[PDB]
Amino acid sequence: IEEGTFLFTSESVGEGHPDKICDQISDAVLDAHLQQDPDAKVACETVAKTGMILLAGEITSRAAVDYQKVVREAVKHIGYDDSSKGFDYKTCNVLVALEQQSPDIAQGVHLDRNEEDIGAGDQGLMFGYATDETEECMPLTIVLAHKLNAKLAELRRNGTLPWLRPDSKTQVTVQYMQDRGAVLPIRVHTIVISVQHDEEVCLDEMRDALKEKVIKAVVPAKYLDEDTIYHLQPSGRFVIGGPQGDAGLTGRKIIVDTYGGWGAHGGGAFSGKDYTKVDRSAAYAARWVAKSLVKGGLCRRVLVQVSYAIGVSHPLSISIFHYGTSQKSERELLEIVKKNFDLRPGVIVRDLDLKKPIYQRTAAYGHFGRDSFPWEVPKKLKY
Amino acid sequence: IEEGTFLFTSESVGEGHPDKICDQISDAVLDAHLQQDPDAKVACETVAKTGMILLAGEITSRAAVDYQKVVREAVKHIGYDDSSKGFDYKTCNVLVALEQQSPDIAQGVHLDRNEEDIGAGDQGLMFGYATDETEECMPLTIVLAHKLNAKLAELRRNGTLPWLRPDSKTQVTVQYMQDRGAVLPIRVHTIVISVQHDEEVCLDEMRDALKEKVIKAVVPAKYLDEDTIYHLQPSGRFVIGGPQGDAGLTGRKIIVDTYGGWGAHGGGAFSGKDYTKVDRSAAYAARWVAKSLVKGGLCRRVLVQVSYAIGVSHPLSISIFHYGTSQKSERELLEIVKKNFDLRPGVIVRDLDLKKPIYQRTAAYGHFGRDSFPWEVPKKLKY
Numbered sequence: 092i093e094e095g096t097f098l099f100t101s102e103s104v105g106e107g108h109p110d111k112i113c114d115q116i117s118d119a120v121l122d123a124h125l126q127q128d129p130d131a132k133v134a135c136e137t138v139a140k141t142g143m144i145l146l147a148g149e150i151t152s153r154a155a156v157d158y159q160k161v162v163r164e165a166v167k168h169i170g171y172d173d174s175s176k177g178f179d180y181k182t183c184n185v186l187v188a189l190e191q192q193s194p195d196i197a198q199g200v201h202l203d204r205n206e207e208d209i210g211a212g213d214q215g216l217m218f219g220y221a222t223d224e225t226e227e228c229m230p231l232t233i234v235l236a237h238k239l240n241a242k243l244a245e246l247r248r249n250g251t252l253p254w255l256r257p258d259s260k261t262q263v264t265v266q267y268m269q270d271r272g273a274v275l276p277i278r279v280h281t282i283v284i285s286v287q288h289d290e291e292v293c294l295d296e297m298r299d300a301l302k303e304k305v306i307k308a309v310v311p312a313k314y315l316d317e318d319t320i321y322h323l324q325p326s327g328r329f330v331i332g333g334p335q336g337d338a339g340l341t342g343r344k345i346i347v348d349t350y351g352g353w354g355a356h357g358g359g360a361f362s363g364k365d366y367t368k369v370d371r372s373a374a375y376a377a378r379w380v381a382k383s384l385v386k387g388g389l390c391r392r393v394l395v396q397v398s399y400a401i402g403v404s405h406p407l408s409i410s411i412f413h414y415g416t417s418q419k420s421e422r423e424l425l426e427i428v429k430k431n432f433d434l435r436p437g438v439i440v441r442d443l444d445l446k447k448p449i450y451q452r453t454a455a456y457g458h459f460g461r462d463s464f465p466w467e468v469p470k471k472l473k474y
Numbered sequence: 475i476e477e478g479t480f481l482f483t484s485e486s487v488g489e490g491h492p493d494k495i496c497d498q499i500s501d502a503v504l505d506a507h508l509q510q511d512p513d514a515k516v517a518c519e520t521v522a523k524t525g526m527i528l529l530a531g532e533i534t535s536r537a538a539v540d541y542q543k544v545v546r547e548a549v550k551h552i553g554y555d556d557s558s559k560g561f562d563y564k565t566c567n568v569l570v571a572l573e574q575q576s577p578d579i580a581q582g583v584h585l586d587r588n589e590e591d592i593g594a595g596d597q598g599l600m601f602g603y604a605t606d607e608t609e610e611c612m613p614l615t616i617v618l619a620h621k622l623n624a625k626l627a628e629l630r631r632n633g634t635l636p637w638l639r640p641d642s643k644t645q646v647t648v649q650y651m652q653d654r655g656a657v658l659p660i661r662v663h664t665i666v667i668s669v670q671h672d673e674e675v676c677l678d679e680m681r682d683a684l685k686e687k688v689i690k691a692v693v694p695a696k697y698l699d700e701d702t703i704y705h706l707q708p709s710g711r712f713v714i715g716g717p718q719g720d721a722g723l724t725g726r727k728i729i730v731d732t733y734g735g736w737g738a739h740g741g742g743a744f745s746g747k748d749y750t751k752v753d754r755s756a757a758y759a760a761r762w763v764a765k766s767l768v769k770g771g772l773c774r775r776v777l778v779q780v781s782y783a784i785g786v787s788h789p790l791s792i793s794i795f796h797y798g799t800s801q802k803s804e805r806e807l808l809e810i811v812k813k814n815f816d817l818r819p820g821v822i823v824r825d826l827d828l829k830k831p832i833y834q835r836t837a838a839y840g841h842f843g844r845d846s847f848p849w850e851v852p853k854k855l856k857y
């Protein structure tokens with residue numbers, strides 16, 4: 092490691108990783124409610140183990156939702172459709188333990204409140220991060236990690252590698268060069284890929300395909316060299332997978348959902364939650380602030396913290412850290428943020444269109460850096 | 475905010491917060507297995523909702539564990555012992571969905587392996603952090619947040635404030651001064667406390683007690699001033715609480731368990747997992763490295779990243795970032811770490827005594843900065 096350079100690692104998981112199954116189901120449930128009742132109050136956890144999807148949590152909604160159909164359709168989309176794969180949407184158990192939202196929360200947060208003045212749905216802290224090292228303003232480590240999982244699913248679904256199954260994990264270590272507080276990717280140091288597979292395909296066939304058809308189809312050759320380390324199917328066998336291999340829960344992939352270890356995290360999970368839960372809406376808004384600061388040329392890399400008290404609409408405080416990449420001071424950046432953004436949840440909902448039922452699309456491959464969701468479209472800053 | 479100073483926020487939760495209930499139950503289950511079989515393979519998730527504790531996951535163990543008794547005793551200790559509190563260990567449902575560990579994982583990780591050479595139980599990334607701003611080398615924001623929750627439980631259990639219930643959350647914002655890469659606490663900017671309570675006590679009595687008997691008994695007066703903001707029972711009413719108010723899951727408080735937003739997090743949860751799951755053992759070891767570097771006078775503040783591939787014993791890479799607080803270079807610090815530590819899980823287990831059934835004690839008030847656990851006792855460094 093040359094002075095002024097360093098390593099960093101991030102991971103991602105595939106659509107059939109059991110924790111990710113749960114995030115996607117939680118958001119399928121949220122979307123189903125929002126399609127009928129844009130003001131649904133949703134706090135839907137999902138738990139997955141062999142043969143079982145359990146929904147647990149709190150929903151107050153005017154919608155009439157068929158949980159059996161919504162869950163099973165989400166599992167079908169993921170690709171768990173036969174007992175030979177370890178899980179089947181047609182024949183699994185779907186159990187439901189859902190109640191109304193606590194009236195004590197409801198009265199303290201949103202009852203008889205003007206929408207713009209709705210209180211935060213909980214206390215908590217949230218961070219937003221952006222880095223100009225990729226065009227979409229995300230760490231390369233996690234971008235590559237996500238793309239490796241997406242490539243697996245693509246080659247599963249197109250029948251190229253029909254021995255693949257939906258459960259996968261990847262991990263990418265990149266060497267970076269310091270650049271005036273920004274970072275510049277140099278090379279890929281190590282790649283890990285583990286993916287569930289059928290009983291017939293042998294290890295050598297898998298490792299060859301993972302290198303030639305997955306890694307080389309994703310990672311630019313300029314980052315790979317004779318010294319890159321590859322751990323491909325390092326466990327040696329991964330036939331049992333999905334929830335049968337490992338329980339899944341909603342909100343157990345919060346670093347995969349965000350910045351891959353870069354930046355910071357306040358702890359809150361996204362999936363299964365409507366916009367009044369600031370764990371999601373304020374994290375989305377903080378990403379939007381950070382990405383706006385970088386795309387607007389004020390920063391090359393930036394971290395934002397916000398925090399809330401349950402029942403209180405305005406953030407308790409906001410702070411900006413620019414890694415030495417701005418000519419503006421911390422105070423000046425905060426002034427710019429305060430003049431251009433309003434981080435009350437009942438204003439974020441409007442700016443980011445957070446009653447729209449697009450949340451299942453966020454629940455795999457990261458919530459940030461993809462598909463021009465509203466929090467990924469920078470706001471033009473006035474100052 | 476004077477130039478060179480900044481705000482930071484962290485939160486904590488109490489023993490009866492539903493997510494924390496689940497962490498404690500998961501670790502009660504782990505400890506019960508370890509008491510009989512020090513080599514138990516445990517991956518026990520817990521889910522909590524009104525009237526229900528569900529265990530889901532994978533356990534291969536020679537122990538004979540009474541899950542009904544272990545779960546109910548954990549709930550009793552927390553203090554949920556009557557339907558008037560919303561949850562009762564005597565009369566709740568305890569459901570069990572536990573299978574053996576996947577044989578495909580077992581064969582790739584530990585079967586027929588020398589203990590020192592056991593593979594990591596999963597891939598993943600983990601960070602360790604330490605900061606000399608408190609003697610126990612933890613961020614003041616989270617230390618104060620934890621202590622506020624502990625004070626609530628103390629005054630509940632001693633009968634001082636008998637209207638308190640076990641579910642609580644706190645959040646502390648501190649203003650800091652930059653100090654040569656270290657940080658120096660200046661003042662407490664905002665405190666939030668929400669705690670479940672009985673039907674009889676009024677809001678004013680609670681807010682007065684929270685200020686006079688909780689905050690003043692925890693936070694040094696030197697940090698509190700006329701401008702400190704207090705959000706005490708900000709929702710106005712919190713009679714419904716525990717799992718009845720909000721579902722809980724294991725591993726949904728991973729930032730409360732660690733550094734309160736400081737440092738970084740790799741995503742893995744601790745509770746319910748034996749030492750072969752590097753999400754826990756390598757995070758503990760990385761804390762131990764970081765704390766050793768600060769107590770050994772090499773750093774004032776430091777962040778360490780390690781990462782693994784399933785089935786591979788040695789970390790894929792290690793990196794140290796010292797925030798400008800060391801005279802040694804990054805390369806030199808890494809050399810010192812490599813000469814003094816061995817971060818294979820099958821060596822960490824020995825150094826940190828990770829077959830010992832002490833894990834339920836880690837599962838509330840943070841895993842770090844408390845009680846001189848082995849990862850909190852610095853290693854004397856040779857160099």
Ligand SMILES: COc1ccc(N2Cc3cnc(NCC4CC4)nc3[C@]3(CCN(Cc4ccn[nH]4)C3)C2=O)cc1
Nearest residue numbers: 097269270271272273352353354738777778779793795
């Ligand atoms: C003059 O330009 C510069 C000057 C310095 C930097 N460096 C140098 C540097 C060197 N080593 C490591 N090793 C990784 C570690 C985890 C231990 N991390 C960094 C970080 C990148 C992640 N940083 C911490 C972090 C991680 C998550 N949140 N924050 C600090 C950084 O920024 C970049 C440009």
Ligand SMILES: COc1ccc(N2Cc3cnc(NCC4CC4)nc3[C@]3(CCN(Cc4ccn[nH]4)C3)C2=O)cc1
Nearest residue numbers: 355394395396410412480652653654655656735736737
């Ligand atoms: C010369 O001495 C110095 C020079 C600079 C520092 N500062 C100055 C500073 C100023 N503002 C904020 N606002 C909080 C933000 C979240 C946005 N954070 C910092 C951090 C503390 C948390 N740091 C990021 C972080 C958070 C989690 N992981 N990393 C960076 C830091 O270190 C300290 C001593």
Ligand SMILES: C[S@@+](CC[C@H](N)C(=O)[O-])C[C@H]1O[C@@H](n2cnc3c(N)ncnc32)[C@H](O)[C@@H]1O
Nearest residue numbers: 285326328329336337517532575578579595596
């Ligand atoms: C390794 S498991 C966690 C440990 C597990 N609960 C146990 O009982 O040991 C975490 C994830 O790794 C992946 N995985 C499961 N089986 C695997 C195998 N045989 N080889 C490699 N990765 C596997 C799946 O994505 C799974 O969700």
Ligand SMILES: C[S@@+](CC[C@H](N)C(=O)[O-])C[C@H]1O[C@@H](n2cnc3c(N)ncnc32)[C@H](O)[C@@H]1O
Nearest residue numbers: 134149192195196212213668709711712719720
């Ligand atoms: C606010 S709840 C999360 C939102 C919830 N699932 C819902 O349906 O709106 C998260 C935590 O806040 C706390 N909490 C629950 N009821 C509360 C209330 N009435 N006032 C303040 N905090 C409360 C409990 O610690 C709970 O676990």
Ligand SMILES: [Cl-]
Nearest residue numbers: 108110337596
């Ligand atoms: Cl996992």
Ligand SMILES: [Cl-]
Nearest residue numbers: 133134364368
């Ligand atoms: Cl929620």
Ligand SMILES: [Cl-]
Nearest residue numbers: 213491493720
């Ligand atoms: Cl919570």
Ligand SMILES: [Cl-]
Nearest residue numbers: 516517747751
């Ligand atoms: Cl596990």
